[PDB]
Ligand SMILES: *[C@@H]1O[C@H](CO)[C@@H](O[C@@H]2O[C@H](CO)[C@@H](O)[C@H](O)[C@H]2NC(C)=O)[C@H](O)[C@H]1NC(C)=O
Ligand SMILES: *[C@@H]1O[C@H](CO)[C@@H](O[C@@H]2O[C@H](CO)[C@@H](O)[C@H](O)[C@H]2NC(C)=O)[C@H](O)[C@H]1NC(C)=O
Ligand SMILES: *[C@@H]1O[C@H](CO)[C@@H](O[C@@H]2O[C@H](CO)[C@@H](O)[C@H](O)[C@H]2NC(C)=O)[C@H](O)[C@H]1NC(C)=O
């Protein structure tokens with residue numbers, strides 16, 4: 001709101017402590033973002049690895065496990081997802097957790113649930129061959145385990161075909177990731193309109209500070225500066241309030257995601 | 270009794286409220302572009318026609334501050350209401366009964382919970398069950414006998430190296446495989462992992 | 478030292494990896510020993526012994542009591558406009 005001018009700063013000083021509150025609010029929002037990611041993903045204590053030999057009763061997770069060939073150590077589906085979606089006193093701070101760490105959490109969770117089942121969510125991970133884990137999971141919806149042991153190959157083939165189909169649907173069909181794109185677009189639009197608001201007179205004689213400062217007498221120049229100051233403060237406060245509302249909504253969504261991860265990944269609902 | 274900083278949430282709620290009131294009060298000492306921050310002096314220092322201008326400046330500044338305070342209060346109240354709804358659900362589901370949804374209240378198999386009061390909140394003590402002292406075994410999905418296949422009614426087959434038993438899943442307690450804790454379904458030529466063994470029935474020895 | 482988060486002076490970068498004490502950013506954070514800065518460690522590392530005919534069954538148990546704290550209220554305040 002001052003753009004490196006002594007007079008503007010001096011005139012703003014007599015407005016009390018306003019922008020301190022704004023900085024406090026923004027800092028709270030950022031800390032909340034980091035806590036959101038931590039709560040969703042850091043559900044495990046250790047980092048499990050899948051064994052080199054993979055015979056899961058005929059099931060095939062190759063499309064979901066990471067591959068060492070790529071440097072990001074991401075999976076096929078994760079690469080598809082990452083490819084599909086794509087200064088004037090303001091800064092963007094990097095997240096605490098880089099993408100590799102998040103990929104590492106997801107890999108650990110997924111290897112743990114392949115090998116141990118739901119046991120690793122309660123105590124220490126206990127190994128169990130995958131076929132009888134699936135038998136246990138049938139037993140939990142009202143079907144005797146008998147059935148699964150007599151239709152194993154058919155079930156494996158159905159699962160593999162479903163995985164391939166979902167991969168193709170993501171690869172070809174677009175506009176399947178509307179929510180994340182919407183979040184990004186909303187943030188970008190808000191920031192852009194905040195920046196563009198700097199080019200408004202708000203009732204003064206010019207939208208550039210230097211001209212009004214260096215053209216005419218200070219006595220009324222202060223009045224013009226007051227016009228600019230109040231306009232820019234209103235714009236900034238509106239921006240901050242919108243950010244707070246959006247942050248609350250995102251936090252609700254993240255809480256839901258944490259519950260779903262706890263209840264449907266580490267157990268059977 | 271010794272460790273502090275375990276009650277951060279209640280403490281920082283109190284701190285946020287107190288800080289909001291403090292800044293709201295301290296905002297009263299700002300000129301807002303007028304000639305003074307005290308109303309009586311500017312009343313008693315100059316004629317009305319400019320006094321109205323000065324009072325207008327003060328009034329608009331203080332109104333803006335008050336509106337900001339109220340909006341912040343509304344946001345915080347919404348958050349607290351969400352937390353209170355969660356607390357009510359936890360009290361109803363984990364104190365008045367045994368919960369099955371994993372990790373909802375306590376890490377481990379939930380057994381019970383007890384409530385305690387706190388100045389502006391509640392404290393749940395969750396009592397949970399945690400297994401320990403593992404041990405590895407060799408397993409099979411079914412047992413062949415007389416050409417038929419046997420599956421456990423409830424439990425799982427294990428072997429210590431020479432003999433086979435059925436145990437409950439969450440606690441090691443072997444038992445002899447009998448026709449009373451197993452059931453039959455078809456011949457054993459399709460299941461992958463069947464093992465040969467014998468199943469004892471408790472009626473034949475009794476009859477003789 | 479130069480990091481993706483900026484430029485850091487007064488501390489030395491090491492090649493170890495511990496838990497995170499004071500989060501700095503971009504996956505790195507610092508702690509006191511002198512002050513050092515390092516890369517986070519997501520946790521321990523183990524490879525569960527998977528096989529197609531091996532299982533693990535617990536033989537004992539423990540009973541754990543944990544605490545959870547939830548705020549449910551805040552102070553009720555009121556303001557008189559014309560007096561304020
Ligand atoms: C699991 O499924 C994947 C599907 O991609 C299989 O990978 C294919 O294997 C065939 C057979 O050699 C190759 O012709 C394809 O080029 C592979 N596809 C890719 C993308 O690499 C994989 O073989 C399956 N797992 C097993 C154990 O057969
Ligand atoms: C596996 O368990 C079985 C049953 O407990 C063991 O067989 C008995 O072991 C006891 C103790 O050594 C002997 O007194 C009995 O004579 C054994 N036979 C029977 C029919 O009871 C077996 O030794 C165990 N094997 C291993 C490797 O632990
Ligand atoms: C468990 O896995 C092992 C290795 O993956 C299986 O051993 C193979 O079994 C097939 C068919 O029985 C043989 O053709 C191979 O020669 C075996 N290889 C080795 C290294 O043993 C074993 O059969 C599997 N057991 C069950 C019950 O599925």
Ligand SMILES: *[C@@H]1O[C@H](CO)[C@@H](O[C@@H]2O[C@H](CO)[C@@H](O)[C@H](O)[C@H]2NC(C)=O)[C@H](O)[C@H]1NC(C)=O
Nearest residue numbers: 412413414415416417457458462463464465466
């Ligand atoms: C379990 O028992 C069955 C039957 O007693 C065995 O199946 C026989 O195996 C022999 C040699 O492998 C064959 O000559 C027979 O034709 C098979 N059938 C019958 C009815 O005897 C089987 O090999 C045994 N072992 C296992 C692991 O199944």
Ligand SMILES: *[C@@H]1O[C@H](CO)[C@@H](O[C@@H]2O[C@H](CO)[C@@H](O)[C@H](O)[C@H]2NC(C)=O)[C@H](O)[C@H]1NC(C)=O
Nearest residue numbers: 402403404405406523524525526527531532533
């Ligand atoms: C159960 O037995 C298996 C088979 O040995 C164990 O797996 C390996 O056991 C050896 C010791 O015989 C260890 O040196 C290896 O480190 C084990 N494998 C891995 C990947 O760690 C298994 O650890 C045994 N289970 C328990 C609880 O001890």
Ligand SMILES: *[C@@H]1O[C@H](CO)[C@@H](O[C@@H]2O[C@H](CO)[C@@H](O)[C@H](O)[C@H]2NC(C)=O)[C@H](O)[C@H]1NC(C)=O
Nearest residue numbers: 399400401402403441535536537538539540541
């Ligand atoms: C299960 O764990 C408990 C401990 O949690 C074991 O009880 C301990 O046993 C040792 C040796 O008898 C005693 O010195 C301890 O004082 C016992 N602890 C308690 C709290 O009583 C128990 O033995 C374990 N179960 C088995 C079968 O070994």
Ligand SMILES: *[C@@H]1O[C@H](CO)[C@@H](O)[C@H](O)[C@H]1NC(C)=O
Nearest residue numbers: 478489490491492493514515
């Ligand atoms: C740390 O590791 C890097 C490469 O990983 C190496 O160049 C360096 O000498 C090591 N020691 C220090 C103090 O950086």
